[PDB]
From a paper:
The barrel was reconstructed by imposing [name] symmetry to a resolution of 3.20 Å, and with C6 symmetry to a resolution of 3.30 Å. The barrel is composed of five stacked dodecameric ‘rings’, termed ring 1 (R1, at the portal end) to ring 5 (R5, at the muzzle end). These structures are formed by four paralogous ring proteins: R1, R2 and R3 are encoded by genes gp43, gp40 and gp35, respectively, whereas R4 and R5 are both encoded by gp34. The ring proteins share highly similar folds and consist of two domains, with three structurally conserved α-helices and a β-sandwich domain. R1 and R2 form an interface for interaction with the tail fibre docking hubs, which are the point of attachment of the tail fibre appendages. The tail hub (TH) proteins form a continuous ‘collar’ around the tail barrel. Each hub assembly is an A2B trimer that consists of two copies of THA (gp38) and one copy of the smaller protein THB (gp39). The C-terminal segment of THB, residues 67–107, extends into the neighbouring hub, resulting in continuous interlocking ring of 12 docking hubs around the barrel. Each docking hub, in turn, interacts with the trimeric tail fibre protein gp22, accommodating its N-terminal residues 1–26. Unexpectedly, well-defined density at the inner surface of R1 and R2 of the tail barrel corresponds to 12 copies of an additional α-helical segment of the same protein, gp45 (residues 214–245).
Virus ΦcrAss001 (Kehishuvirus primarius) was the first representative of this order to be isolated in pure culture from human faecal samples. Here, we present the characterization of ΦcrAss001 using cryo-electron microscopy (cryo-EM), enabling de novo structure building and elucidation of functions for around 1,440 protein subunits constituting the virion, leading to the identification of a novel ‘crass fold’ in the distal part of the tail. The virion possesses a short non-contractile tail extending approximately 44 nm from an icosahedral capsid. The extended tail barrel formed by widely conserved paralogous ring proteins has a high capacity for storage of cargo proteins alongside the capsid cargo zone, ensuring that the proteins required for the initial stages of crassvirus infection are carried inside virions and delivered to the host cell.
Author numbering:
A (entry chain E), B (entry chain E), C (entry chain E): 1 to 238
D (entry chain F): 1 to 18, 25 to 238
């Protein structure tokens, strides 16, 4: 469904049938609520505990097809542009793509073959570095986030006497906002995520109805406006 | 039941018998609610936890016959049209049909015979690639979604020294909207999913009554219009 | 009970005894509600979890006699009329009868004798095709629904070097609507399922009273007309 | 209605279906000023409806609504009650303000006419600036004109100040007053003056003038005080 259909069925589901009908929502408000509902839905469906099914990214066909249009593959750029201080002397710093929402798969291609990057926790890092070896298992590499400015910088730890040729990252692209109409105005240009032009929902049509329902629920919680509704509907932001 | 019958029995079940009868619903509103009810019903019945029976796509004769008219078989087109970056060096990119709602069965015919495609999760992918072999079992192939624009693109991983001849996908077609009347108007053409012409329900007649009941429930929740009803009836969007 | 008796006892049970009697229902409304009640009753009684007894199609003498008048035996027509794309290279496409509600028994007569068709699920299909043999057990055949337009098309998989002579389907016929009076009018012909003429209930007289009670309950839920009653009485649509 | 029609149909209503023209002019001018106030305030009239509360009220004030710019009062170096207040003079022919906006470098901002109580309340807090799309306004030392302090947010400059207001009505005069009456003026004009208002409210102005005449000529104190209630 295109943006006009988002807005028309938003109006239908919000106030065109309600008995003591409420004021219609302005297009900026509808775009804001739709973008919020989109992000909430993405976060709810990525995490199993966030939805009533207990199903995350790839726990069912529907969850695969939900994020299928939001998956992207890119590469981390070696961060030798400027000097820096790494926590580990034997780690190579890489910069992830700017439009990164969530990392789901990483791999590094070295001279000793491809290796799956395992994101190790800080307590896990301490445990592993208290051991005599201090290097990954055969077909794996280690990873920790380092000092990041304006984009995520990442330290890749591989086994000794190994060089990294490329660093691929299969991630979830940051969703683009849903903007119903050109938000340009003479009184001031308002933006949802830095863009005023019309922006279609760049995800699969399977969850457009879900985004619409969530947006309507958020609109009605805003209309109710007491602390109660804000608190319970803020639980699903996550 | 054709579209006229959808609308007439919608009117019967909505406001023609109700004591303090409500305003009749316009045909655009009825078409919108019917399309929403259709999608909600499809998602509820595909997933066992979404309905009170706990029965999914093929858990009973009724669930088979429900989606029987919505199943389609097509092929993935090899994506050598333009270059791209694949997460796996040894994966062939294929494009699924545009009108895809849910994938239920995939198979690939290679020079070594037909092989069932197993959609592997990202954590499952990492586990499998940490192993020495890194290839499917005998009569199977692996699959992961890759960078997709305007349609789902898919990476097929098969065993070494194997070529893919065709890639069949048994999926669930995207339901067409239910539109009662030609939505063309002089004041502006409104569309449900990009189509203004009359559109019959293209599913089996077994669930037409179910779609009608769901549409009436959604209409009455819209009429009630408080946050409560929107929140509980948004649970079954799923 | 004929249609006049359906309508007269509908009036008796609806508003002729109720103290603050409601408006009488028009014959189109009574026919619509009776058809809805008929379909609801059929779906409730076919499935054990849908009724309070936990008894399905053949779990008791009453359930047998309920559908006894709605069972039909027909044949699937070989779909060599036009080309198509089958998911399985070794499957023969057949078209089921148009007036099919639910399949309860299938059998195929081959040159190697009669074989019971087992409807295999998609996950079951993947499991079976990951095995070395990939063919049914001795006295059975496999079946999956394929691309269907306007009627269910079915793929029959039998063992190698076997030809199918006929494909019998014992199913439940689609119930005909209950229409009390000729719905022809000068202001517009209204139909329940494409028919305006009088239509008797074509099921056993054992469940006519049940259909009447359900229709009256639906009428009173429509009269009450709030979201509550619609939601709880929509649970038994199923 | 032309002024001749006003004078002639005053005689029909006041002289029992048929006063000096100066006296008629005085009452008609007084009547319109009453009618404008009564139909502006919702509580002043019988319907409980103010300026924009119905289609009739919108056409009533339609020909009085005027849009003008305020001019910076940089000529006189007076003293403002607020540090960041820019003094602006309003139009001379101003009766009632209904919308004010200020065009800053940051953007147009709707001016809120802030009461003396709200100022002390909002200026007793940490930040002490308006909300991001509004400006405050309080009247200041005014000489034969209206001067307003525009308290816009600091770090911003005012480039424009538009005022939408009700223009002061012109007098209704039915004859050249200097012809028979020496130097009498109604609001500084001695010559024939037409009604500058929509014809919809001419009847109510005429009816009010007739009531004012009859109460004035009856001479009873009760009548004078009773009909003086509607003077505001």
């Amino acid at each position: 469904m295109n943006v006009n259909e988002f807005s028309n069925e938003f109006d239908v589901l919000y106030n065109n049938i309600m008995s003591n009908a409420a004021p219609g929502l302005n297009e900026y408000e509808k775009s804001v609520l739709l973008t919020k509902a989109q992000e909430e839905i993405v976060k709810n469906y990525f995490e199993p505990a966030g939805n009533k099914y207990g199903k995350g990214l790839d726990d069912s066909p529907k969850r695969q097809i939900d994020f299928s249009e939001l998956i992207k593959v890119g590469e981390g750029v070696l961060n030798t542009s400027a000097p820096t201080i790494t926590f580990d002397k034997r780690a190579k710093v890489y910069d992830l793509p700017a439009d990164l929402f969530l990392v789901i798969n990483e791999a590094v291609d070295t001279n000793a073959g491809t290796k799956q990057i395992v994101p190790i926790s800080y307590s896990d890092y301490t445990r592993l570095m208290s051991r005599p070896y201090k290097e990954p298992v055969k077909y794996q590499a280690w990873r920790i986030i380092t000092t990041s400015i304006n984009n995520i910088s990442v330290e890749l730890i591989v086994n000794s006497n190994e060089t990294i040729t490329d660093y691929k990252v299969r991630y979830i692209r940051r969703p683009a906002p849903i903007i119903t109409t050109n938000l340009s105005s003479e009184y001031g240009d308002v933006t949802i995520n830095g863009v005023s032009t019309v922006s279609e929902c760049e995800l699969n049509p399977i969850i457009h109805s879900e985004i619409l329902q969530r947006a309507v629920e958020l609109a009605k919680a805003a209309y109710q406006g007491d602390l109660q509704a804000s608190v319970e509907l803020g639980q699903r932001s996550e």
